[PDB]
């Protein structure tokens, strides 16, 4: 009820931004082949 | 000899398919 | 008010400052390593193993 | 000697003439609700 | 050196107890909220107007239920397809009345299962595995999104969605039979063949390995202790189980290749559940199964009954009785 | 087993009975399902279930509607159930056939066979015609 | 024969419109004759009431009710375009009708944008345009 | 009084799931 | 009244269904690059 | 034979077109041959849909799906959804049939006589998958065409004939779009809505001014972004996130084409503006409201006050109130209270269904429409008998909405599976372990103890 | 139906949408004749 | 005349499809003879314009 609502958009785009900037973090290079 | 093994299953099967094609053209 | 046609469900002005400080607070973390790198260094691979 | 792919071709289209004959009589004859 | 690189090194570490990964960044917050709301809504949750007629259906344990009858009730017919979060409900009492927690659980479930699926990909990348276990898990993800998401979309309401329970499942299956005739639809037919075939080739492969085990134990200890973990010797005579099934049916019907054998175990169910979950999907938009009612007639024109006409009279019994108060007009358009 | 005694249907308001030739009963079914059967399927009426195609319900209309000559009368001029006013503007007809594109090409023998199907179907299926879903 | 499904033309005696149809063509012996006066009198009657439904337009624009002007020209006037296209027979009669439509589509295009004069201006372009239609044919 | 047994069966089932995941007998080569 | 439509359709499938393998059969006799 | 067996390539006959990854002429001839089949179907289907056309039945009862797209463009359509001519539909199906014989000849030329690689002889057309300057140019050339193809809708709806507006005042007719909507708060208003009920993300465009005004902005973006990717080169963050290989670009498309696959399958179920109910039949929501409106008219003639008619549950039998406050229809049809249709919008107000307008102004074309949309509801079966699942076999009708929402939806899941297969392989083909684990070097053995 | 100069070819047109299925089967027939190699 | 030319248009496209992929899959048949075949393309394209002409005149 507009105080809870603020709390959800924090928590969503906290973890969504960890997802988005996780695969931008040179993620194909993280393999057991090399580096 | 295996001519009794297959043709106990295939000689009926072609005979029934001779009947199932005839039942498509039967109407009332 | 549910069926209003408002962007990302942003009803009040206060919810924007939540969105901008969420993407940017992790963006600034991301730029601490992958930012300030050479934007002019290429490769003829399928996949780059440049640096951290 | 006959090439094997000719055998599977002629028998394979023979089945299609059998199957599509069965889907024909779903719309005609008995069991068609006409 | 940086704080982000020391965080990416931890979150993608296979040296954790459970691999978290980048999909776990939105698997774990989603599925723990779908869980922690499910346990509360299954145990302690007030009754819910499901039919939109203000007749609240009890579904939790504190309101006199058990494991079988208790269920998280779907949302109201009054809401229908509208998004109904907590902050758009003006109190939690108004939220729990109108079928609140069904949308909170389901939407955090389908995000967490579609992230559990991508997490199975990610660890296969970091371990050197060939990647496609997550394609086999697409088959229950297709079926979970068919009864919780796609079927409420095409029917236009989450109230037609599947109740999160055990007796609510069979309320879902029977009402789906009367309104859509799923048993005559060839995609439920292609997945009954998927799980009857799947449980066949499971118990058929699991018996032929256990039949042809090599002597490595005594008769006092267990059969299973003849396998030391991580050994490189093959633990069963695969030529023996090939010669058995090569005589049990005939010779040419037997896979001597164990790789092509262990692929056919993954093909048959998964293709059977992809096809089935697109049976619920095409029947979500009212493209029902076959209808052979009054199909056989004599030359006079009188209707001769078939087994489909007996099956129809079972469908007419459920159709005239489902949601016995919600209807006002002669045709269940919804 | 379509005997000519079973194909013999009542034709006028007085009560004369004539027989339907076997092309009338065949075109009578194809035209009825294509034209009328969208709402009058099996004798019930979807959009107004009180006024059906029952032989009981056709007889109780204020002009008696059981005859072939009475049904083709209704098609060219549909009055209501009490026959006081016309509902040609909402029922498909010949008089109001500019709005309905489905009835711009119908001859006299075509309505003679459609009305033949409405009359000869309660004689084939006694209780299924207009009995609702109870008698499916 | 009674249950023959693909009897395209051997079944019936009258010639059909196409083998993929049930209906006979629009030729002779039909019961629908489009030259009849009651079809012409039905299409003429909606053209007369259309002007009567269109003079009530400024009464809502003199008031503040924009929801009543957006649908007054669709509630009754839905049957106009079916008639005025059908009454348009000759050459110059046809290109007189799109003068009426484009004047009428700007009444609806101004009612959604809530412009008071643009409704009252384009209403007078419509009464004058149906005046051109009815007086010729 | 009746639903107290059902709750104890459910959370008691989730206990042995917890112990099976984290206190599992870890398999070792050699 | 000899049902010209069905006679037309069944020949025209059999022309087309036999014009496909005839592209391959004429190549197998010619020993071309299949 | 070299290049066309498993000894040379390593691919079996069943995964045989995977041999075309690293040849470019054979691959070009394959993409222009399948383009020759997409054209060829659409020409041959419309000729099939013309030869079975009957003017008696409506356009949706006859079970067509392609001649109703051209009627939305406005060819051969009359007022109120009445198809008149069907000579222009013949003309379109021939151009999409003759042209496939030319695209057919390119598929048989470029893949059987063309050089295997274009990079040797033709340096403009030749490429490499690992190259990143060329691939954004191929993306850039083929984006400016999608910009120009979006303006052909806009040119046709403003200048060349016009398009079919079902909301057109006076009845549904071919209407020139005079003043399209160019407001980015409105046009991108749709793209950032909720996808749930009431908002309805991009399906809920409800007039042709937002459609034709929206395809302008698509042509603006696809040309500027077409020129953007011709000139530029992928940035530092874009080179680190992707896999620059042949199969990886294919699994990028298969994810996006599945997005378009679901969305076109949800346009056809809800939208009655781009898909007029006069042509495609009534929607799922529309046939639920047409039933409640028909029995509203039926019992109003019996002198019954329908507003105060207390329903059996205690709610409104006919008129009740939505959870946002609007006057709606009652029953199971209370879920579809967002139904905005050209035959019910004459009865709206600010509040909803105006009770004064229901008591007095119900026009008989609305009664002819709600009775038509009740009996032709989109509820069918696979053997094409209509009605409910327990309907007897007399009618022959399945709505063309239910064929499009169940087939493009059907495909759009399998192309999401194509995003999963082809990107699992392409990410692992870039890393080297798509053939299996090395026996000499297993990565699990050089890790920590297991715990 | 088709225009009057084209009503003759109404059987041939009915076969035409089926023909794209026949290209899918043409691949397997071609793989059989090549010997699946 | 339209029913005669379209019937001549179909019979040529029967003659091409039987012969043109046979002319291409053979290792040399297209290079040795294409000026024979290039006439049949130019005849085939010319018929489409003649039919498009005769259709517009007749309507
Ligand atoms: C994601 C993949 C992972 C799955 C996790 C799912 C949880 C994700 C989070 C929730 C997002 C759910 C998507 C909601 C889609 C939906 O309700 O979509 C519905 C909307 C249609 O909106 C409807 O739009 C309508 C608009 O009509 C209005 O406007 C029209 C204008 O003509 C007409 O006038 C009509 O009469 C009038 O009412 C109404 O507003 C309805 O109320 C509104 O529901 O579609 C649209 O958003 C467009 C279509 C979106 C694509 C839907 C894909 C479904 C995904 C299934 C995937 C299965 C495979 C899973 C694999 C994993
Ligand atoms: C336009 C999209 C597209 C493209 C270009 C490709 C291209 C390719 N795929 Mg891929 N694929 C796609 C979509 C696509 N795929 C989708 C959507 C899926 C998910 C189903 C897959 C799943 C897939 C797998 C699992 C594999 C490939 C493989 C391949 C390669 C060889 C293909 C081959 O020889 O098959 C030849 C075709 C056949 C043998 C026919 C297959 C049998 C089909 C199912 C019968 C058709 C049924 C029915 C008659 C028609 C469908 C009805 C339905 C539409 C209603 C090639 C790179 C192979 C690969 O990995 O190579 C690297 C491989 O193993 N693909
Ligand atoms: C969309 C369908 C499609 C298309 C366009 C292609 C295209 C191609 N495939 Mg292919 N393929 C397909 C489906 C398709 N495939 C399927 C479903 C399978 C699984 C069975 C395969 C399995 C497969 C294998 C195993 C191989 C190919 C190969 C090839 C390529 C060369 C063929 C060649 O040189 O041999 C010569 C081809 C022939 C002699 C066939 C002659 C048939 C003619 C062309 C039919 C023409 C009929 C048409 C109506 C005529 C129109 C003419 C016009 C003037 C009007 C070619 C690009 C080969 C490859 O990778 O090349 C390197 C290869 O090894 N395919
Ligand atoms: C996307 C499709 C595509 C692509 C990339 C190519 C590419 C190529 N073709 Mg090819 N071709 C195609 C389709 C395609 N073709 C089709 C459909 C056919 C059948 C008509 C042919 C028939 C063909 C032959 C017979 C030959 C080639 C040749 C060539 C190569 C050189 C072409 C040249 O001289 O350029 C410069 C050419 C031009 C500037 C002329 C362009 C004229 C056209 C009409 C402009 C296109 C208009 C417009 C963009 C299309 C709009 C329609 C669209 C919406 C579908 C080149 C690699 C030649 C080759 O490889 O040499 C051995 C060769 O001999 N092609
Ligand atoms: C067929 C469609 C298509 C395809 C496949 C691509 C493919 C690509 N584009 Mg491209 N593009 C297209 C159409 C297309 N483009 C059009 C039509 C435009 C015009 C609007 C652009 C504009 C564009 C830009 C400006 C950039 C790309 C980039 C890229 C690369 C991938 C980045 C990506 O997908 O991130 C997906 C990311 C998102 C959907 C969200 C990104 C959010 C941004 C980064 C926030 C920063 C604000 C920024 C200034 C934009 C303001 C809008 C808003 C977000 C605030 C890739 C080569 C990037 C690249 O490498 O350039 C060469 C890049 O920087 N494209
Ligand atoms: C089995 C194959 C198959 C078949 C037969 C169809 C069939 C169809 N699809 Mg389709 N589809 C398929 C697979 C298939 N699909 C797959 C696998 C996908 C991916 C999941 C899709 C995704 C898809 C989408 C996204 C859509 C369709 C749509 C359609 C329908 C219309 C075709 C169309 O829009 O042409 C499209 C043709 C082109 C893009 C070519 C360019 C056309 C130009 C731009 C037109 C210019 C017009 C202009 C105004 C003319 C003016 C000329 C003047 C200036 C002189 C049709 C029923 C559409 C539909 O109706 O949705 C319900 C639609 O929106 N399909
Ligand atoms: C050979 C060249 C040629 C071509 C292409 C055409 C084409 C056409 N003529 Mg025509 N004609 C020709 C020569 C030709 N004619 C000759 C030599 C004469 C004698 C001087 C005439 C005299 C003539 C008359 C008198 C008339 C026509 C008409 C028409 C149009 C019929 C469609 C219609 O009703 O308009 C409505 C328009 C459409 C239905 C649009 C159809 C085109 C769509 C956009 C399909 C195209 C899609 C795309 C290109 C296909 C995909 C291909 C892709 C793979 C590359 C059609 C466009 C009629 C006309 O124009 O009336 C308006 C007409 O009455 N013709
Ligand atoms: C393929 C499968 C199908 C794919 C889905 C198809 C796309 C569906 C359409 C998406 C709509 C996108 C529009 C913007 C979002 C929207 O408005 O939602 C905003 C809506 C609107 O939210 C509600 O709006 C209402 C207004 O009517 C009220 O204001 C409510 O208060 C407000 O909550 O809320 C949600 O739906 C929230 C969604 C949260 C899901 C986030 C998870 C995504 C994580 C994925 C990882 C990111 C990577 C993908 C990004 C790249
Ligand atoms: C357009 C046109 C045309 C053309 C056409 C064409 C040319 C077509 C093609 C088509 C084709 C191209 C066809 C194909 C066919 C094929 C077939 C029909 C096959 C099948 C078979 C089977 C199915 C078998 C198989 C197999 C084998 C062989 C072995 C292994 C197993 C199997 C069984 C799988 C014409 C001229 C008419 C004119 C009109 C127009
Ligand atoms: C026509 C029209 C219109 C318009 C349209 C529009 C304008 C559109 C737009 C569109 C758009 C605007 C879209 C967008 C999209 C986007 C997307 C969909 C995205 C995606 C992304 C991605 C995919 C990413 C991923 C990732 C991640 C997450 C991480 C890292 C990696 C990567 C990068 C990969 C309208 C509505 C008016 C109406 C109707 C008509
Ligand atoms: O909500 Mn659950 O169930 Ca699907 O049908 Mn209509 O809606 Mn109600 O009725 Mn029946
Ligand atoms: Fe095993």
Automatic annotation (TrEMBL), chain F:
Chain residues that bind heme b 2: 40, 48, 91
Gene Ontology molecular function, alphabetical: electron transfer activity; heme binding; iron ion binding
Segments forming domain Cytochrome c: 23-122
Keywords: Chloroplast, Electron transport, Heme, Iron, Membrane, Metal-binding, Photosynthesis, Photosystem II, Plastid, Thylakoid, Transport
Residues binding heme c, per UniProt: 36, 39-40, 91
GO terms (BP aspect): photosynthesis, light reaction; respiratory electron transport chain
Record keyword Electron transport present: yes
Source organism, top-level taxon: Eukaryota
GO cellular component: chloroplast thylakoid membrane; photosystem II
Cofactor entry: heme c
Cofactor note: Binds 1 heme c group covalently per subunit.
Membrane topology: Peripheral membrane protein
Subcellular location: Membrane; Plastid, Chloroplast thylakoid membrane
Residues bound to heme b 1: 40, 48, 91
Subunit structure: PSII is composed of 1 copy each of membrane proteins PsbA, PsbB, PsbC, PsbD, PsbE, PsbF, PsbH, PsbI, PsbJ, PsbK, PsbL, PsbM, PsbT, PsbY, PsbZ, Psb30/Ycf12, at least 3 peripheral proteins of the oxygen-evolving complex and a large number of cofactors. It forms dimeric complexes.
Family that this chain belongs to: Belongs to the cytochrome c family. PsbV subfamily.
Functional summary from the UniProt entry: One of the extrinsic, lumenal subunits of photosystem II (PSII). PSII is a light-driven water plastoquinone oxidoreductase, using light energy to abstract electrons from H(2)O, generating a proton gradient subsequently used for ATP formation. The extrinsic proteins stabilize the structure of photosystem II oxygen-evolving complex (OEC), the ion environment of oxygen evolution and protect the OEC against heat-induced inactivation. Low-potential cytochrome c that plays a role in the OEC of PSII.
Name this polypeptide is given: Photosystem II extrinsic protein V
Species annotation: Chaetoceros neogracilis
Residues of the full protein shown: 28 to 163 of 163
Automatic annotation (TrEMBL), chain G:
Keywords, ordered alphabetically: Signal, Thylakoid
Protein name, per record: Extrinsic protein in photosystem II
Whole sequence portion shown: 75 to 211 of 211
């Amino acid at each position: 009820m507009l105080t809870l609502k603020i709390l959800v958009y924090t928590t969503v785009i906290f973890f969504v931004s960890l997802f988005i900037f996780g695969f931008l973090s040179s993620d194909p290079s993280r393999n057991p082949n090399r580096k | 000899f295996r001519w009794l093994a297959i043709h106990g299953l295939a000689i009926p099967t072609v005979f029934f398919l001779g009947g199932i094609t005839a039942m498509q053209f039967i109407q009332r | 008010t549910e069926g209003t046609n408002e962007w990302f469900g942003v009803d009040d002005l206060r919810l924007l400052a939540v969105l901008f400080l969420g993407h940017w607070a992790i963006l600034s973390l991301w730029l601490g390593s992958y930012g300030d790198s050479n934007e002019d260094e290429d490769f003829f691979g399928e996949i780059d193993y440049s640096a951290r | 000697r006959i090439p094997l792919w000719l055998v599977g071709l002629v028998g394979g289209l023979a089945v299609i003439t059998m199957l599509s004959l069965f889907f024909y009589g779903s719309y005609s004859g008995l069991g068609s609700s006409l | 050196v940086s704080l982000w690189e020391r965080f990416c090194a931890w979150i993608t570490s296979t040296e954790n107890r459970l691999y978290i990964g980048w999909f776990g960044c939105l698997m774990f917050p989603t599925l723990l909220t779908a869980t922690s709301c499910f346990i509360i809504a299954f145990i302690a949750a007030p009754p819910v107007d499901i039919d939109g007629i203000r007749e609240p259906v009890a579904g939790s344990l504190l309101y006199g239920n058990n494991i079988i009858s208790g269920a998280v009730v779907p949302s109201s017919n009054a809401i229908g397809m509208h998004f109904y979060p907590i902050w758009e409900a003006a109190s939690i009492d108004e939220w729990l009345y109108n079928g609140g927690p069904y949308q909170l659980i389901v939407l955090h479930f389908l995000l967490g299962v579609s992230a559990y699926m991508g997490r199975e990909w990610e660890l296969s990348y970091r371990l050197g595995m060939r990647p496609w276990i997550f394609v086999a898990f697409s088959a229950p993800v297709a079926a979970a999104s068919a009864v919780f998401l796609v079927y409420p979309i095409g029917q236009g309401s989450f109230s037609d969605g599947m109740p999160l329970g055990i007796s609510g499942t069979f309320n879902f299956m029977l009402v789906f039979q009367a309104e859509h005739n799923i048993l005559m639809h060839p995609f439920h037919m292609a997945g009954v063949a998927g799980v009857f075939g799947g449980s066949l080739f499971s118990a058929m492969h699991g018996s032929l390995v256990t039949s042809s085990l090599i002597r490595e134990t005594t008769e006092n200890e267990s059969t299973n202790y003849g396998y030391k973990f991580g050994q490189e010797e093959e633990t069963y005579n695969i030529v023996a189980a090939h010669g058995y099934f090569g005589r049990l049916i005939f010779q040419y019907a037997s896979f001597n290749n164990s790789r092509a054998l262990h692929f056919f175990l993954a093909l048959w169910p998964v293709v059977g559940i992809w096809i089935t979950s697109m049976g619920i999907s095409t029947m979500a938009f009212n493209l029902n199964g076959f209808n052979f009612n009054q199909s056989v007639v004599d030359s006079q024109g009188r209707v001769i009954n078939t087994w489909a006409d007996i099956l129809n009279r079972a469908n007419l019994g459920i159709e005239v009785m489902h949601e016995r108060n919600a209807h006002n007009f002669p045709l269940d358009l919804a | 087993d379509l005997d000519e005694a079973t194909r013999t249907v009542v034709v006028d308001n007085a009560g004369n009975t004539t027989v339907l030739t076997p092309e009338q009963v065949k075109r009578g079914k194809r035209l009825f399902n294509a034209t009328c059967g969208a709402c009058h399927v099996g004798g019930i009426t979807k959009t107004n279930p009180n006024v059906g195609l029952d032989p009981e319900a056709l007889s109780l209309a204020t002009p008696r509607r059981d005859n072939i000559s009475a049904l083709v009368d209704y098609i060219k001029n549909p009055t209501t159930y009490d026959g006081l006013e016309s509902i040609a503007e909402v029922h498909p007809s010949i008089k109001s056939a500019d709005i309905y594109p489905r009835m711009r090409s119908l001859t006299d023998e075509d309505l003679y066979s459609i009305a033949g199907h409405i009359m000869l179907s309660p004689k084939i299926a006694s209780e299924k015609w207009g009995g609702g879903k109870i008698y499916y | 024969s009674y249950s023959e499904g693909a009897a395209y033309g051997t079944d019936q005696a009258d010639k059909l419109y196409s083998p993929y149809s049930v209906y006979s063509p629009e030729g002779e012996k039909s019961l629908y004759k489009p030259d009849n006066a009651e079809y012409l009198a039905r299409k003429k009657a909606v053209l007369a009431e259309t002007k009567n439904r269109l003079q009530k337009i400024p009464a809502y624009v003199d008031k503040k009710e924009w929801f009543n002007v957006k649908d007054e020209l669709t509630r009754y006037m839905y049957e106009t375009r079916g008639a005025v296209r059908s009454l348009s027979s000759s050459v110059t009669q046809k290109e007189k009708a799109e003068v009426f439509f484009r004047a009428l589509e700007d009444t609806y295009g101004a009612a959604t944008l809530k412009k008071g004069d643009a409704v009252k201006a384009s209403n007078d372009k419509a009464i004058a345009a149906l005046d051109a239609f009815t007086a010729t044919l | 009084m009746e639903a107290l047994v059902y709750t104890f069966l459910l959370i008691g089932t989730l206990m042995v799931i917890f112990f099976a995941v984290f206190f599992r007998e870890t398999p070792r080569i050699l | 009244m000899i049902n010209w439509q069905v006679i037309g359709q069944l020949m025209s499938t059999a022309v087309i269904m036999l014009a496909g393998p005839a592209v391959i059969v004429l190549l197998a006799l010619k020993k071309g690059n299949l | 034979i070299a290049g066309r067996d498993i000894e040379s390539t390593g691919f079996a006959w069943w995964s045989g077109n995977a041999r075309l990854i690293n040849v470019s002429g054979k691959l070009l001839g394959a993409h222009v041959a399948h383009a020759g089949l997409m054209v060829f179907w659409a020409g041959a289907m419309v000729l099939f849909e013309v030869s079975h056309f009957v003017p008696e039945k409506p356009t949706y009862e006859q079970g067509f799906i392609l001649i109703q797209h051209l009627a939305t463009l406005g060819y051969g359509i009359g007022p109120g959804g009445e198809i008149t001519s069907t000579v222009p539909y013949f003309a379109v199906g021939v151009i999409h049939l003759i042209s496939s014989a030319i695209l057919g000849f390119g598929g048989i030329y470029h893949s059987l006589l063309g050089p295997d690689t274009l990079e040797e002889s033709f340096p403009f057309f030749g490429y490499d998958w690992r190259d990143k300057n060329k691939m954004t140019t191929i993306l850039g050339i083929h984006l400016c065409l999608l910009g120009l193809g979006s303006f052909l809708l806009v040119i046709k709806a403003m200048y060349l004939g016009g398009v079919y507006d079902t909301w057109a005042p006076g009845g549904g007719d071919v209407r020139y779009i005079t003043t399209p909507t160019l407001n980015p708060i409105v046009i991108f208003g749709y793209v950032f809505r909720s996808p749930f009920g009431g908002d309805g993300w991009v399906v809920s465009v409800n007039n042709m001014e937002d459609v034709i005004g929206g395809h302008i902005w698509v042509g603006i973006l696809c040309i500027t972004g077409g020129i953007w990717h011709i000139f530029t080169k992928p940035f530092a963050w874009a080179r680190r996130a992707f896999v620059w290989s042949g199969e990886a670009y294919l699994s990028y498309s298969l994810a996006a084409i599945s997005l378009m696959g679901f969305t076109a399958a949800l346009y056809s179920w809800y939208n009655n503006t781009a898909y007029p109910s006069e042509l495609y039949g009534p929607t799922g929501p529309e046939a639920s409201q047409a039933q409640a409106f028909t029995f509203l008219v039926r019992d109003q003639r019996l002198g019954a006050n329908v507003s105060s008619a207390q329903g059996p549950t205690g709610l409104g039998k006919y008129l009740m109130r939505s959870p946002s406050g609007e006057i709606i229809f009652g029953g199971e049809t209370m879920r579809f209270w967002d139904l905005r249709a050209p035959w019910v919008e004459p009865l709206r107000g600010p509040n909803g269904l105006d009770i004064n307008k229901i008591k007095n102004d119900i026009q008989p074309w609305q009664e002819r429409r709600a009775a038509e949309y009740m009996t032709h509801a989109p509820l069918g079966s696979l053997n094409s008998v209509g009605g409910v699942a327990t309907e007897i076999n007399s009618v022959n009708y399945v709505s063309p909405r239910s064929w499009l929402c169940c087939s493009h939806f059907f495909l759009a899941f399998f192309f999401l599976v194509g995003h999963w297969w082809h990107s699992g392989r392409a990410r692992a083909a870039a890393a080297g372990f798509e053939k299996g684990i090395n026996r000499a070097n297993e990565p699990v053995l050089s890790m920590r103890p297991i715990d | 139906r088709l225009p009057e100069a084209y009503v003759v070819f109404s059987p041939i047109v009915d076969v035409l949408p089926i023909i794209p299925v026949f290209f899918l089967l043409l691949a397997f027939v071609w793989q059989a004749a090549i010997g699946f190699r | 005349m339209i029913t005669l030319l379209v019937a001549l248009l179909v019979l040529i496209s029967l003659g091409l499809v039987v012969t043109v992929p046979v002319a291409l899959a053979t290792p040399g048949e297209w290079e040795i003879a294409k000026g024979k075949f290039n006439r049949f393309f130019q005849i085939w394209v010319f018929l489409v314009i003649v039919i498009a002409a005769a259709d517009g005149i007749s309507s």
